[model samples]
Target: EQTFIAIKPDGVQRGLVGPIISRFENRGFKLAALKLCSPSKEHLEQHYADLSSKPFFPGLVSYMLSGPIVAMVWEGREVVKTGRTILGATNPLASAPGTIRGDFAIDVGRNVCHGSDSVENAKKEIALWFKPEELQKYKHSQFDWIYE
Candidate 1:
C-alpha cells in the first residue's frame, strides 16, 4: 500500500523535517515522492475541504500556508495504517510518547505532520498533492530483508 504524509509548516519552521522523514525511511517504507513547497490558500482550502464546516477551518488553512511544507508519498505494505501510527494522534497531548507528534508538537493546531487515514484517502491525497510522473517506482535495497 501507499500513503501520503505531509510535514506541516510548523514542522518545517522548527527543523523537524529531517527527523520526521527519517522515521518513515528507517521504518522500512519506500519514499516514492517528496517535495518542499508552500501551497496557495486555494489549494490548502481544497485539501482541507472536509473540515470546511468546522469553525477553525480558516485558521487551520492559514497555518498551513504560513510557510513551506514537506509533502511525501511513502509506499510499502500497510503503509497507510502504519504511517498514521508513526504520526501519532491529531491532538499531540494524546499521542504516544515515541510518536512524531508526541515528541515535537505541543498543540493540536500545530501537530507536526499529517498522514492519510485510509487507503481510499491515501489515493485521493496522493493525487491531490502529486502528479503520476512525480511518483517514483523503484525497489529498496533492503526490501527482502525488511519483508518476508
Candidate 2:
C-alpha cells in the first residue's frame, strides 16, 4: 500500500526532516518519492477544498504557505491506515504523547505533519504532489514482508 506524508512548515523549519523520515524507514516502509517545496495558494485551495467551508480555511492555507514542506509517498502494507496511527491526531494537543505531533508539537493549528486519511485520499495526494514521470519505480528487498 502507499500513502502520502508531508512535513508541515513547522517540521521543515525545525529541521525535523531526517528524524521524521527515519521513523518511516525504521518501520520498514519504503520512500517512494520525496521533495521539498512551498505549495502555492492554488494548490492548497484545491487540496484542502473540503475544508473551505470551515472558518479556519484562511489560516490553514496561510500556514501551509508559510514555508517549505517535505512531501513524500510512502509504501508498505496497509500504510494508508497505519501511517496515520504513527502520525497521531490532527491536533497535537489531543495526540498521544508518543506520537509525532504529541512529542514535538503543541498547537492544533500548527501541527507538524499531514498524512492521507484514506486509501482514496492517498492516491489523490500522490497525484497532487508528484507528476507521473516524477514518481520513481524501484524494488525493495523487504517488499515481501511489508505487503501480502
Candidate 3:
C-alpha cells in the first residue's frame, strides 16, 4: 500500500523533516518519492478542496504557503492507515507522546504534518502531489523481515 504525507510549513520551519522521515523509515516503510518545494495556491486549493466550505480553509492555505513543505510518498503494507497513526491526531493536544504531532506539534492550526486519511484518499493525494515518473519503484531489503 502507499500513502502521501506532507511535512507542513511549520514542520519545515521547525526543521523536523529529518526526524519525521526517520520515523517512517524506522517503521520499515519505503520512501517512494520526496521533494521540498513551495506549493502554489492552485495546488494547495485543490489539495484542500474538501475543506473549502469550512471557515478555516483560507487560513489553512495561507499557512501552508508561508514556507516550503516536504511532500512524500511512502510505500508499505497498510501504509495509509499506519501513517495516519504515526502523525497522531489532528489536534496535537490529543495526540499521544510517541506520535509525530504528539511530539512536535503545538496546536491544531500549526499541526506539523498531514497524512492521507484513507487508502482512496492516499491514491488521490499521491497522484495530486507526484507525477508518474517521479515515483520510484524499489525494494527495501528489510521488507521481508518487516512483513510476513
Candidate 1: give the clashing pairs. none
Per-model tally of clashing residue pairs: 0, 0, 0
What are the lDDT scores of the predictions, listed in order?
0.92, 0.89, 0.93
- List the candidates ranked by TM-score, beginning with the highest: 3, 1, 2
RMSD to true structure for each model, in Å: 0.8, 1.3, 0.7
* Candidate 3 structure lDDT: 0.93
Which 10-residue window of candidate 2 scores lowest in summed lDDT? 139-148
lDDT by residue (tens digit), candidate 1, 1-148? 8999999988988999889999998999999999998888999898888999999999999888888999999999999999989999989999999999989998988898999989999999899999999999999999999999
Model 1, residue 66: displacement in angstroms? 0.5
Worst 10 residues of 1 by lDDT: 59-68
Please give, for residues 1-148, the per-residue lDDT of candidate 3 as tens digits. 8999999988998899999999999999999999998889999999999999999999999988999999999999889889989999999999999999998987899998999999999999999999999999988988779989
The reply for model 3, stretches above 4 Å from the true place, is none
The all-Cα superposition gives candidate 2 an RMSD in Å to the true structure of 1.3
Best-fitting candidate, measured by lDDT? Answer: 3
**Candidate 1 Cα lDDT to native:** 0.92
Off by over 4 Å in 2: 144-148
Candidate 1 off by > 4 Å: none
